Symmetry: D2
Subunit: 346 residues, 4 copies
Amino acid sequence: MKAVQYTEIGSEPVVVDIPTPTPGPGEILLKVTAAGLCYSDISVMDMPAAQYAYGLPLTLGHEGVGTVAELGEGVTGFGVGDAVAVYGPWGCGACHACARGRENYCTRAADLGITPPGLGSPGSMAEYMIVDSARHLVPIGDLDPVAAAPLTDAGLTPYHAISRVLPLLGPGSTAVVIGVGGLGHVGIQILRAVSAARVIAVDLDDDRLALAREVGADAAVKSGAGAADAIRELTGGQGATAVFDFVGAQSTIDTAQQVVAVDGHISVVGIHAGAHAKVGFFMIPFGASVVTPFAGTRSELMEVVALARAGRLDIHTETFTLDEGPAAYRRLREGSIRGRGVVVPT
Amino acid sequence: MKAVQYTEIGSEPVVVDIPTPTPGPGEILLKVTAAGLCYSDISVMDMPAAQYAYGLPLTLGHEGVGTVAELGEGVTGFGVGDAVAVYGPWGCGACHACARGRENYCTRAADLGITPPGLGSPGSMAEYMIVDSARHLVPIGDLDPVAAAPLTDAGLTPYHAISRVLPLLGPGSTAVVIGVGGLGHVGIQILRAVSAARVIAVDLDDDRLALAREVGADAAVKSGAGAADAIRELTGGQGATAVFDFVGAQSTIDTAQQVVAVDGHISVVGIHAGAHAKVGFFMIPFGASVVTPFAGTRSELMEVVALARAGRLDIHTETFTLDEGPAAYRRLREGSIRGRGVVVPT
Amino acid sequence: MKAVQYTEIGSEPVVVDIPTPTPGPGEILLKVTAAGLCYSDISVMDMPAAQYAYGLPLTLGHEGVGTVAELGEGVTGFGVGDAVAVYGPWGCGACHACARGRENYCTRAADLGITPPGLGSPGSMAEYMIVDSARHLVPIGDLDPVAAAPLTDAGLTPYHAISRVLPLLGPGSTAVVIGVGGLGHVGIQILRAVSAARVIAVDLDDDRLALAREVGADAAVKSGAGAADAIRELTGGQGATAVFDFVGAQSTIDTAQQVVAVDGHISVVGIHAGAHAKVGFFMIPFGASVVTPFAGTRSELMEVVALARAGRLDIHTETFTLDEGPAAYRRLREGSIRGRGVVVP
Amino acid sequence: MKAVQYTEIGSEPVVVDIPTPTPGPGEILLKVTAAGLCYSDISVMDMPAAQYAYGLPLTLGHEGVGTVAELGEGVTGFGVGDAVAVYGPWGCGACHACARGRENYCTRAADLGITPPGLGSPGSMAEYMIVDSARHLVPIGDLDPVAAAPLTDAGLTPYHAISRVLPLLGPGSTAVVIGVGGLGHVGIQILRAVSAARVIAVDLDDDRLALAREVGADAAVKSGAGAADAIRELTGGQGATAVFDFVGAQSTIDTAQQVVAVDGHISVVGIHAGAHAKVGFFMIPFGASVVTPFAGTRSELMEVVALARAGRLDIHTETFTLDEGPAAYRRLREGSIRGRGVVVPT
Ligand SMILES: NC(=O)c1ccc[n+]([C@@H]2O[C@H](COP(=O)([O-])OP(=O)(O)OC[C@H]3O[C@@H](n4cnc5c(N)ncnc54)[C@H](O)[C@@H]3O)[C@@H](O)[C@H]2O)c1
Ligand SMILES: NC(=O)c1ccc[n+]([C@@H]2O[C@H](COP(=O)([O-])OP(=O)(O)OC[C@H]3O[C@@H](n4cnc5c(N)ncnc54)[C@H](O)[C@@H]3O)[C@@H](O)[C@H]2O)c1
Ligand SMILES: NC(=O)c1ccc[n+]([C@@H]2O[C@H](COP(=O)([O-])OP(=O)(O)OC[C@H]3O[C@@H](n4cnc5c(N)ncnc54)[C@H](O)[C@@H]3O)[C@@H](O)[C@H]2O)c1
Ligand SMILES: NC(=O)c1ccc[n+]([C@@H]2O[C@H](COP(=O)([O-])OP(=O)(O)OC[C@H]3O[C@@H](n4cnc5c(N)ncnc54)[C@H](O)[C@@H]3O)[C@@H](O)[C@H]2O)c1
Ligand SMILES: C[C@@H](CCC(=O)O)C(=O)O
Ligand SMILES: C[C@@H](CCC(=O)O)C(=O)O
Ligand SMILES: C[C@@H](CCC(=O)O)C(=O)O
Ligand SMILES: [Zn+2]
Ligand SMILES: [Zn+2]
Ligand SMILES: [Zn+2]
Ligand SMILES: [Zn+2]
Ligand SMILES: [Zn+2]
Ligand SMILES: [Zn+2]
Ligand SMILES: [Zn+2]
Ligand SMILES: [Zn+2]
């Protein structure tokens, strides 16, 4: 087998029966124990035919954890039964970025026909999944799979975004988190674990602001036209050292530019087509850098797993069966999952 | 004493006779040996009455070198006759940024009424000038004052911009320099001295491309619509690790976005009101950060001076008298100074 | 004031009456609200006549907080009544290190005759004290002075030592803290606040191990011959990413070398004359760097103050009067102050 | 095939005929084009029987370049004929260090029985060699193999040592290089290429001081009792920002401690059993860190190759045949190779 696939442009994903794959040389077959739903899946399924490039059908799910079921020829660095998380943004493994584990920034992958699981290659929303190479597996030991699956993107992506500017986030700093969803609720917790920043969370929804306080935000601010003034009141007029925008709409990016401090940072993490920061003199403070980060690195995924194993990340989830996969995507689309949706096969 | 002042909104600067100042407690009086002209002075003098905030009259010149003439009460660490460069972007000296020498990013200066020489306080285009505090002087020893004056902004600003991302500029990297004027011709030389980056220079003017090659650029490319494709051809389709845009027009920022590499950097250094980078998904590569840097730090100015003393910077200048100051500004406006204009008071 | 001074080589410090100073141009007079005792004061007072270089008499105390009492001529940026901490390791203010606020690493100060309060210039163990320049004052707002005074060295020094290698201390890292005294008990708390490192504390004294657990250590291990094996058991045989040795005896440095990981770090912070790490092939792991850090930077002191104001540092103190100053030093010498001794004028 | 092997404890290496190997799955067979001699080979061959752990016989050579001769089953990313350099310090590929390319600091390799070529596995001093995995090959394009072979250790090791502290080596800094041999003569050139440090070279031999000046040292100091005072005279009494000791004898480490600046660095790179820095209060300046670095990282090797391709490294070599291999080791032992000895098979 059972899997959840995107099969027709503009249609909802469907539950299918397809062959259980067998690993070729160097590949590993996992029995999937948990598969996370990411809002990027919604954006992908909303692409018109002219833009959509991942092929049909596509087994969804780029947040995957499992146990090693079968080793392909020549694979010996894992044993059958090992609990592993899948490193998602597969790169070529050979370029200068990849040599540093920064496969998220590989520029050679596309030309070599290397695509990530759930985003061009078959994903984790299935009873079993293939992983191309052992370097794309990270051990998780006895971590609960349901809470582990989101670490692979909801954890990894905020972790990487924060890591890019961690030296800015010393005692006395303030970090703003915009969007307390799958990514944002983990982002707050990463900030608390790896920095002494004061954390201000921003969301449209009072229940998400409650979630933010539950996971350790120091303050919670309603998003929209009043947010910039409210944040500036909290920061004593100086603004926020860093803003991590997990929404990335034009309104939230505007809020971010209106509150960022001199020599601070805006990380535009959320993906809303057309929205952008306007980085120019008189439009942003001196020295305030802006970036659109993507995914994270191999060693960053290991660090996220280490945070989880140390008890520093309380991942808020709701569990679904494979048969409930399409229903779960409807819930994600409408904004009614408090945290991360996770499919648990069987 | 003789000085060059901006005295009337919309009018050319004029040569004046005003009193030689006397240093109060903590201040230092310099006999000016060289005063650099910066294109920012043109932009300032082009501001309409409603925007112009630096007061009239204003003695111009924020690139200053001199010899210590008189010590104000309680000043130590300098003797009469010492050759010094003036650190330009005065801050409060007390905040967290200033404590690190990063007075360029002080947020307290404005509210305390602290303004820089030539940009709210009296500048260096005069026989003598006041410096507010000893911490705003850096010794230059026997460096030629004419070539030293530009170090204080034409050197400092590119040096800071490059320093923000120096770890990116390893062997195999490429740095693009857009605009081979006062700042840009120094920026090329800094890149060559402190990194192993391949340097590609870009300018509208073929004589400035020649200047770029003279000061060590590896390649020089005509600016305009064909520049992005030409740069991409030189970088093997991978793009440039970093782009230092010393023009900052919309067209040059667009060129920068079209050539920057994944996980690279654009530094928008030149100031053209309204121009901005558009930093959003699908509009810039993943991981490519963008910033508008401002001036530089105390320790950075010392490092620039150290480069000059080591013979690493060939500063291209043309010398003017104080009486020629207004004529020199006309030359700067029309683009006919090959490098930096420098006034030498007699 | 009344002051406590070291007055005679080899003798205990004494309570004295000396003139209240007046600030000259650029100086600030503080009314002292709290003055910390540091174990370095013991080491200084144990120096023989041939080594001791700070002059007699010396008003002790290089951990100082106060309120601005008088401004010297030309001083700006502070008002009378402002609560401030004194930045201790005064530098020249002009060199490349000082320009970055790294006055702790100034090499010009000695030749210019610049000495720190309590260590060549008059210290904070007195009703009033002089500060040379406004850049050596950091505002503390409404922070309790008793808990604030130790921030200026018990806080600053561990903070700097940790900061030198903070990028190593990611999730999955382990930091060992040897010596849970004035410095060490703050070091544990800094590690918890600014990193995700697992913290293993080491001390001779079971009550100090309890203190370590109270302030957030993940494990606390008895020092001595068994400590290295115990630490290696806790780290799965891989050793510790960083070791912060706040004792710095040969035995503790040896423990540090026996537990540090490949590509890790040993910070020798505690001062024991003659003791040293042996950094050579076959004697330490590949890539494991070793340093003796000193004090900290201007911006680091500001950051320490920010941690305290945010409630991230529970500074364990015992309070003494000026008259009790000599008794407090005897207590420090014998090891009976649980945390930091602080004199309140 | 012909090879040079260490075959008997305490005896000179010998030229042998042994079978040409065949690559198994994931392995690559190279036709060797150049094999560097490293002084570590001398130290290894001087180990008594009780210490020597690399097995007999051992094909020597841990500096290897070649062309791809045969691909083992499942190998991708290289074609037959590709010119490649061998990354020497093989790690497990999977741990946190290896995920960052830092296989030089892998702690899992020993327990997994992973040993480097020339140092437990068969080396490059042979007509052909096996490489275990594609990730241990770096393309060199048309670089001359003779000058390329030393990049793999004589280049890599100094490059890594310098890289650990590159942010210290700003304009105005001084770097001391002790020992102008295989590693040291490359170290000087790396410092000149990637920093603005003033470079002071130190050697016992006047001809090696001449070599140092030939490759870009600013100053040259005779090693021994007068070296520390001479270096301090050159640095104005302040001492050297960093000392890279490629000898690592007690006398050179003592020199390094006597000249290092406050908040500087000593890198003990050369290996002399028993010698060590004494890092304690009153024995070294405040803030001066000391480390024994080992080899370098995957991305560092790529950077070294990039320096060579850009013309930044003039590698001084002497060429030997395989039959001359033992004679070349005698020359290395006696100190008569001016730079790096390189064996060029058939
Ligand atoms: N850059 C990357 O590599 C990367 C990786 C993964 C996901 N993403 C993107 O991150 C974004 C978030 O993904 P998710 O799975 O956490 O989404 P989610 O649907 O789980 O959460 C969205 C959250 O944002 C809040 N929100 C929406 N509009 C808002 C506004 N105007 N102001 C404040 N809050 C607002 C919602 O109320 C909700 O709490 C998506 O755009 C996704 O595509 C990016
Ligand atoms: N960010 C800061 O802190 C800071 C500090 C100093 C100066 N500036 C700004 O930097 C800019 C440069 O100042 P300068 O004094 O070196 O100027 P300048 O007049 O000396 O040099 C301008 C150069 O840019 C070239 N140029 C102009 N338009 C171009 C285009 N479209 N493409 C390529 N080249 C082009 C010119 O031919 C000339 O060589 C100005 O905008 C100035 O205000 C900024
Ligand atoms: N590097 C610097 O700039 C700097 C600055 C300030 C203080 N110091 C030094 O730091 C050291 C500590 O100062 P303090 O004021 O915190 O001392 P303290 O007397 O308050 O505490 C000492 C602690 O170390 C423990 N201890 C002693 N020997 C031990 C051993 N062998 N193993 C484990 N634990 C042991 C004690 O039980 C006690 O808890 C002193 O040497 C002091 O001079 C250094
Ligand atoms: N740390 C590592 O990862 C690593 C890697 C490779 C090599 N090494 C070691 O680096 C060292 C250098 O190797 P190499 O192949 O360049 O050696 P080499 O024999 O080619 O060069 C030695 C050089 O050091 C000089 N020298 C010797 N004694 C000296 C002294 N007392 N003072 C000043 N100069 C002196 C010689 O005159 C010669 O120029 C060796 O100990 C080697 O084992 C270490
Ligand atoms: C479609 C989207 C996927 C991001 C993700 O991995 O969540 C992207 O490629 O930008
Ligand atoms: C007025 C202008 C001055 C920049 C400069 O210092 O050259 C600015 O601050 O934007
Ligand atoms: C013998 C030495 C080898 C270093 C090298 O690779 O040159 C070591 O591993 O200790
Ligand atoms: Zn996703
Ligand atoms: Zn790649
Ligand atoms: Zn300017
Ligand atoms: Zn300031
Ligand atoms: Zn102390
Ligand atoms: Zn100084
Ligand atoms: Zn070697
Ligand atoms: Zn490994």
